[PDB]
UniProtKB/Swiss-Prot annotation:
The chain holds residues 221 to 313 of 911 of the full protein. Belongs to the MAGUK family. It is found in: Cell membrane; Basolateral cell membrane; Endoplasmic reticulum membrane; Postsynaptic density. Transmembrane segments: none annotated. It comes from Rattus norvegicus. Residues 4-90 form the PDZ domain. This is Disks large homolog 1. Phosphorylated by MAPK12. Phosphorylation of Ser-12 regulates association with GRIN2A. Ubiquitinated; by MARCHF2 which results in its degradation. The PDZ domains may also mediate association to membranes by binding to EPB41 and ADGRA2 together with the L27 domain that binds CASK and DLG2. The L27 domain may regulate DLG1 self-association. The N-terminal alternatively spliced region is capable of binding several SH3 domains and also moderates the level of protein oligomerization. The gene is Dlg1.
Amino acid sequence: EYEEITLERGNSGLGFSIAGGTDNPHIGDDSSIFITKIITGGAAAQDGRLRVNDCILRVNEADVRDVTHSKAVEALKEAGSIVRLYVKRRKAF
């Protein structure tokens, strides 16, 4: 099951936060950064944005799995007006 979320841009804090660590905070093999928390009180929360805690599959139709910490923050922010995130979840066991 996959559900894409197309939210609008912000200005200085959409409302949701993200965590990452490819080569900025500490060395690592997995560049794919994950979400930490969705802070209510922003364009993101206003339109929606659920509580995430994992890495996104793609951003703005492009995979941002090739970034650093400061790049990921900008990869979204600099994504443009409307930002669309795709997330898929497979069922098993």
